Amino acid sequence: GRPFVEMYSEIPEIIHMTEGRELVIPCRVTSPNITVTLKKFPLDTLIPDGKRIIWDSRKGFIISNATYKEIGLLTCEATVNGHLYKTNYLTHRQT
Ligand code: NA
């Protein structure tokens, strides 16, 4: 039920992307104070800069201009009360 509004575990949510276009990783959370980390598999953290990558607790991560670097398995992580919670997204190019 928390911290992610919609959690995808073993079966990731598939998201279609296009290079040069906005990509939203929709791991919105149930309250705005939850710190969420974005990792690209295997172990590649994407830090939001408020520019090319924005965090919005009500929307998820917004990537204004998606690149080849965002193709693949993306995971949002949040830690609550000593527990690590994960939700998974698999991107691939529209065509
Ligand atoms: Na989600």
Contact (Cβ atoms closer than 8 angstroms) between residue 3 and residue 50: no
Structural domain of 32? 1-95
Say which CATH number the domain at 26 has. Answer: 2.60.40.10
Phi-psi sector, 82: left (phi>0), alpha (psi -120 to 50), beta = left
Find the 36 Cα to ligand 1 centroid distance in Å. Answer: 12
Q: What resolution in Å is listed for this PDB structure?
A: 2.0
Q: Which residues in 1-95 belong to E strands, given as ranges?
A: 13-17, 23-25, 36-40, 44-46, 53-56, 60-63, 72-80, 83-93
Find the 95 Cα to ligand 1 centroid distance in Å. Answer: 23
Tally the domains of the chain.
1
